[PDB]
RNA sequence: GCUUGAGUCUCGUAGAGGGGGGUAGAAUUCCAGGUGUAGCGGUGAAAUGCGUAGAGAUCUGGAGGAAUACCGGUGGCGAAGGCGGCCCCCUGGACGAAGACUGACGCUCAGGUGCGAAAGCGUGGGGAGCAAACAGGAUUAGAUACCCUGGUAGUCCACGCC
RNA sequence: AGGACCGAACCGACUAAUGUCGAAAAAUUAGCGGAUGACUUGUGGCUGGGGGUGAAAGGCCAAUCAAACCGGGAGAUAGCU
RNA sequence: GCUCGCCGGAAGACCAAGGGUUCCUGUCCAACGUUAAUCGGGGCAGGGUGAGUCGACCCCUAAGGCGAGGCCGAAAGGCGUAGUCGAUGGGAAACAGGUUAAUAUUCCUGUACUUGGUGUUACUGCGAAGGGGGGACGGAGAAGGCUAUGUUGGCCGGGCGACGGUUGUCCCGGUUUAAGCGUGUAGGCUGGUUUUCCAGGCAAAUCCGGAAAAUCAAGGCUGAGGCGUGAUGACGAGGCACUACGGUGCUGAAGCAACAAAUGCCCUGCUUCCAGGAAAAGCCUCUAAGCAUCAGGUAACAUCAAAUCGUACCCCAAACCGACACAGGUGGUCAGGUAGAGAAUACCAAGGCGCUUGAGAGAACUCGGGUGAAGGAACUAGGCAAAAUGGUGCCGUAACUUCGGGAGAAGGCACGCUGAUAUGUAGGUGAGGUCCCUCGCGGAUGGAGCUGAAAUCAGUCGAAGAUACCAGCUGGCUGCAACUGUUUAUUAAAAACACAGCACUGUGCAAACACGAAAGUGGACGUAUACGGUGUGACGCCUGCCCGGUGCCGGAAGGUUAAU
RNA sequence: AAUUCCUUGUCGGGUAAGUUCCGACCUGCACGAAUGGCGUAAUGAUGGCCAGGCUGUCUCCACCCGAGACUCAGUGAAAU
RNA sequence: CUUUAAUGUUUGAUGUUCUAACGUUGACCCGUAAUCCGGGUUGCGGACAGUGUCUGGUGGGUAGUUUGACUGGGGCGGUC
RNA sequence: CGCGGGGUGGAGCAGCCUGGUAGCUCGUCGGGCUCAUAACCCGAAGGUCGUCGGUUCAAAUCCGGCCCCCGCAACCA
């Protein structure tokens, strides 16, 4: 059985990265909402 | 030649092969080979538009001439080749100036024959001439629609057009399927039937003997569930709806001939 | 060894002998168009069928296929089946004449090999006419027959089989 | 030569047994089929909700699918408990 | 520390992925560990990651994404050109040994290589987002030539041995050496050099390509390995000498021969077949706009520089992914001895571990297995489960058939050890020796050494000799589906699906059709011997009657009939 | 008969005994020609049946070797 | 009134021709080393095609809903 | 159990719905044609309308009871 989750930094950051959000308007909403909430880990990064 | 292979195994048992003892078994000319990544039938968005497309074998495209634009210069059929994405073979000819370029392969042709285009090229299989210099009742191929576009009609193995008449600026053709189109008089054609004349008798024998070519298994409509296709479902193989396509359009007899701006050029449709 | 068997060579004869490739006209059919009008077609009679949307008849043009009138003759040719519009190309057989040359190289032949109408079959083309099967209409005690209107394979083409 | 044969790797998952608060939210053990192919698999992209994908089971789309997940309409509605 | 046991194509040793200090040392034991625990992947403090040659970054592109203008779209935004990103791909360069508690082709020792900057000297035409060559390529299969590496022998060092023999064909341990430089071999590709000419390469061209003669038959390119060198060097079993008894300092013989041999290399070859097998830059070549006492380019030489990031450890697992120290999943590489065809399997080596609860007991019962009198499916929904058949060579083998098969059909025979043929054969490799030569890594020739099946005969032993593990149950009638294959992940692998084949039918190209409100794409850079839809399902023998109802196609006169 | 309710239809074979199976009879509830018909070499982790081999499947179990169950010390859940 | 004939006039309905609207996924050139695109040539179609408003037809391709109750349980039947 | 339909000369079918009147084909009988038969031609005859009751001026017909016959249904667990 292959557990439904294999890690891959490159692939992760190309779909959940900071710039993975800034390329679209929707991402600008997500960056806004998480900031509106007061979250600390906005997106998987350094 | 045609050879029904020996029944050494179930799957090979029903294969018939096209053994061509002429085609150059070396590697083709590089400068006329460009990349050609298959697309499995997916559009710009990425969704599959046409079904049964994909897999296949990695192939490279052979850019060939269609125009026969460099006129007045004779040529020699240096050698024949094999083309993956055609039906007919292609030949690498050489102009007298020293420029090699591919052209399709007409029926009766050997490596070392003479071919040329323009208007001075005589009546021999391979010469390209505008249709106002071609005899009525002749067999041609690679017929153009517009002068200079290149050639569209009759391009596969043994597909030939019989010129009917030449009234005014409208020359009449009789297509391979059976439709009388009337085209521009300056449309360039090429004498003789296209080569690879045994292509029709070739059978595959295997499911894989079609798979590496590019097709995908065709699922019948009656097997699918009613939410998928306008047929199918039912406890125990039922049917009874009017045969259609995956989108409701009645098939098995339903004309969709509608372009209308080409209505003027079509004299007779398929019987 | 000879020459009357048989065979080769020089010159010619007539011929639907055969294979491949071109081409011509009458006729039929179909399609488009003009003229024009109620029947047309068919049979023993009739009906099926076609027709006032406008057939057939008649005139013009075009697209295909098959078969080659008269010549044609119990004529000719080939082993036979079989083969006839004309033409070019490749090519086979027989026969006639004056001599020569080889010098019995012969006659026949189970098995073996090949050719072998049509119908019929495989593969891929072609489809006018004709036409199994089949349908319809009649005749008939009955008629899945003769007769009538349609009609698929087929007949046609190349490679094979039989 | 082969969608050819035998058979490990590898992939898959036919019978039985164990297990069922298990070692494990489908596995282990003994045996099975493919095993040069329509083969297998890594890295990287693409197709997305009445949409995708499908050698087609209404199977699959993050342990969830006869229409995913999250937030919002919304304290939906209930002659029902 | 001494025995015992287990894996050993792994439970071993290294990279990638991913973790994130889990690595080492000292100290501590409440909590964590399914037990205690002075122990530890636990807490606490400290230490550890050293690069011009490894990788990333960088230059260059694939799929595909973003996309100036631009086209389209109610807005958002969609598509896409020029461009620019994007490795799993291509592209410059280092090997061996030593060292620390923990890092090393990164530090030290020795010996080398690559790319640019600048300067000097002697020559000399250089010069692009442009052209050309090159990079640059399929699967499968076979042979030859080698190496990695292992065994054997000689040689060197040690022992002659706690129960019987063992100074001998005895036993134990060792016998390792790279990159770079030089040579250019086995072998592979291809006819070279020269004169002239040209509507070809969106311009030019001395470059390629084409077309004619001249001259000679080689030149050139590529190229594993070996041999020398690297190296009177390092390493090195074993001693010598100090122990904080952890280890260190010192010293140090031989270091060759032969055979067997890979899936590594030559081979990004060769032969063949088809389903016909990235692109670009680096690199080299050629000239244009031009610039030419120049500048630049080339060769040699001196010298400078090559940054930044990662580097510990785990990586078939108590550290990844599964809530856990979880019998699960996880790509790549190296991969020794004997038996054996083999990476199977049995037992071992290097190496790493004894699975984180143990001690007695020897009941029922359950799980995992061993054997079993007589019979032999009488069990049972059913021979499910077990039992059993199980290797090689050889002999032999039916119905049916598409003439390939069925077939490993079925069914049998010899299998051990020892001697002999033969103080080990056929066969293989093959020195010394001899002659030859376009003189070298050469050719005939020569044959010792080394190595080594099978077969035949005889003798002999056990109840049993393919002695273990490993390792087909066979056969007859017959339904269905042609057969390979695919699918209900997680109760259904099947007669279901698919399949090649056939048939109907749509499609004349801005093709039908499909996604998309559109543009634009896919279809196809294909075009009727093509492509889409549908039904059926190899192949063989075929495929009858019905156009009433529905649908489709053809036909339009008339009736009815919408907006206008 | 993957199709036949009545039916286990009738006859024949296989068995000591055969609602299954093989082969035929047509009385086809309600088969049938590309929602393809009837055969078919080979193949199938497929479906039904018989024969041989073979055995603890069974007659009818007994003993044997390990993991637990039982006891001792340590740790210490669960549905309800 | 009807039948008819010439003209004027009224728009309508066919056929052919033309070029300027327009289409051009035809060739060439330039913006530009750019197969998108824009513009300029020129050829071919051509007042068609195509798009928009209105309109009949077809329409499970898609969508929102309906599909009664009584019933000695519901269904069928019967019934209101 | 229930729904629908059918029963008519010797046989097979009209007629019923919308009541007073029963027709068609074959077959039987008789004659003719023929040497004789079939076929053909001409002519004539034959029905309690399954059974019973009722409503009605009048019933094969319209209603209800009964028998026979055909199809459908006879169900979900
Ligand atoms: C009826 O038979 C019923 C169906 C149950 S489906 C879960 N079964 C009764 O035992």
Curated annotation (Swiss-Prot), chain A:
The keyword Signal does not apply. One of its GO terms (molecular function) is structural constituent of ribosome. NCBIfam families: rpmH_bact (TIGR01030). The gene is rpmH. It comes from Escherichia coli O45:K1 (strain S88 / ExPEC). One of its GO terms (biological process) is translation. The keyword Repeat does not apply. One of its GO terms (cellular component) is ribonucleoprotein complex. This is Large ribosomal subunit protein bL34. Signal peptide: none annotated.
Swiss-Prot record, chain B:
The modification N6-acetyllysine is found at residue 241. Coiled coil: none annotated. The keyword Cytoplasm does not apply. PROSITE patterns: RIBOSOMAL_L2 (PS00467). Keywords: Acetylation, Ribonucleoprotein, Ribosomal protein, RNA-binding, rRNA-binding. GO terms for cellular component: cytoplasm; cytosol; cytosolic large ribosomal subunit; DnaA-L2 complex. Changing residue 229 to Q: Loss of peptidyltransferase activity in reconstituted ribosomes. No change in rRNA binding or assembly into ribosomes. GO terms for biological process: cytoplasmic translation; negative regulation of DNA-templated DNA replication initiation; ribosomal large subunit assembly. InterPro entries: NA-bd_OB-fold, Rib_uL2_dom2, Ribosomal_uL2, Ribosomal_uL2_bac/org-type, Ribosomal_uL2_C, Ribosomal_uL2_CS, Ribosomal_uL2_dom3, Ribosomal_uL2_RNA-bd_dom. One of its GO terms (molecular function) is rRNA binding. Residues 27-52, 220-271 are annotated as: Disordered. Pfam families: Ribosomal_L2, Ribosomal_L2_C. NCBIfam families: rplB_bact. Belongs to the universal ribosomal protein uL2 family. This protein can be partially replaced in vivo by its H.marismortui (HmaL2) or human (L8, from the 60S cytoplasmic ribosome) homolog. One of the primary rRNA binding proteins. Located near the base of the L1 stalk, it is probably also mobile. Required for association of the 30S and 50S subunits to form the 70S ribosome, for tRNA binding and peptide bond formation. It has been suggested to have peptidyltransferase activity; this is highly controversial. In the E.coli 70S ribosome in the initiation state it has been modeled to make several contacts with the 16S rRNA (forming bridge B7b, PubMed:12809609); these contacts are broken in the model with bound EF-G. This is Large ribosomal subunit protein uL2. It comes from Escherichia coli (strain K12). The gene is rplB.
